[PDB]
Design a binder for this molecule. Structure first.
Ligand SMILES: [Ca+2]
Lengths: 250, 69
């Protein structure tokens, strides 16, 4: 688990940037909070759902949900949730008092899809937040996530087309949003495939780095499929990094 | 530079997403609630005419600028 200071630096380092691990197209409000909670929990908590659903996730003892009571002061690093709209809204608190708080957020104005709205620091006079999710920060800075075996390049094979690939036997369960599986090759330029539905799952036997994504390779009804499963930063060696998952592995 | 016509195959108004089947008879296109052009909508109904642009992203083809009829 990471420190309050690292959350502070993360929040400000992302001021003005588009945060899009993908999932939904553009810079949505839940994309920012999902990326943030993933980061400060060193990878242990990947929130699923819409913005309003965030208070329903399993925080694995790494955070407390609080209701917004007229006495409650948000703190730096808290996640502010709006539960009483259709799909909700969510923000990364920077500072708080009893009259207002300030936060980093995406899609407050509705520009996330079109891209003209990026993560922005705004002020809110308690205009709909119903809960605050407080991380249980660690006292020291942590780099667990950055050094994790998942973010360690290790050994990969490579074919003549530049696809890095490995054998791996595990199961992947799709998260909240569907993902389009590609026939025959892990290539976003392959137009054939089918929509892997949320909460569906498959065993898989191969993992690939192709087209800026990590993919799983698996077999289904006589056909070989490749499913994109998270972002890859495009780099090999000690610069290699991959993003938060689009499902759950086991 | 036309926009595709298509049908809301289904939409889950609780979760905020569904699928549109283009007229050109290609891949089912993912539609997300953020892609419906504001104006007090934020929900589409099963089997209704919609016109939209198609964006190809890492997760698959997604519907942009979705408009009723
Ligand atoms: Ca996104």
């Amino acid at each position: 688990m990471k420190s309050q200071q690292q959350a502070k630096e993360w929040i400000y380092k992302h001021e003005g940037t588009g945060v899009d691990f993908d999932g939904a197209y553009g810079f949505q409000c839940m994309d920012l909070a999902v990326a943030y909670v993933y980061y400060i929990t060193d990878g242990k908590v990947r929130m699923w759902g819409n913005a309003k659903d965030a208070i329903n996730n399993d925080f694995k003892g790494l955070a407390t949900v609080y209701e917004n009571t007229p006495s409650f002061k948000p703190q730096l690093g808290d996640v502010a949730v709006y539960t009483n709209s259709q799909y909700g809204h969510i923000q990364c608190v920077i500072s708080g008092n009893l009259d207002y708080y300030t936060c980093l957020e995406q899609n407050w104005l509705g520009g996330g899809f079109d891209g003209w709205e990026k993560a922005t620091i705004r002020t809110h006079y308690y205009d709909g937040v119903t809960h605050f999710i407080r991380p249980k920060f660690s006292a020291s800075n942590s780099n667990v996530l950055e050094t994790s075996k998942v973010n360690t390049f290790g050994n990969w094979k490579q074919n003549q087309y530049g696809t890095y690939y490995r054998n791996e036997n595990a199961t992947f369960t799709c998260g909240f949003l569907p993902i389009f599986a590609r026939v025959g090759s892990p290539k976003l330029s392959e137009p054939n495939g089918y929509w892997f539905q949320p909460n569906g799952y498959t065993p898989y036997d191969e993992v690939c780095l192709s087209d800026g994504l990590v993919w799983i390779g698996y077999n289904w009804q006589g056909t070989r499929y490749y499913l994109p499963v998270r972002q890859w930063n495009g780099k090999t060696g000690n610069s290699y990094s991959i993003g938060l998952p689009w499902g759950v592995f086991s | 530079m036309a926009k595709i016509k298509g049908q809301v195959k289904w939409f889950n108004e609780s979760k905020g997403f569904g699928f549109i089947t283009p007229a050109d008879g290609s891949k089912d296109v993912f539609v997300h609630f953020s892609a419906i052009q504001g104006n007090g909508f934020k929900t589409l109904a099963e089997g209704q005419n919609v016109e939209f642009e198609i964006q190809d992203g890492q997760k698959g083809p997604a519907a942009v600028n979705v408009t009723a009829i």
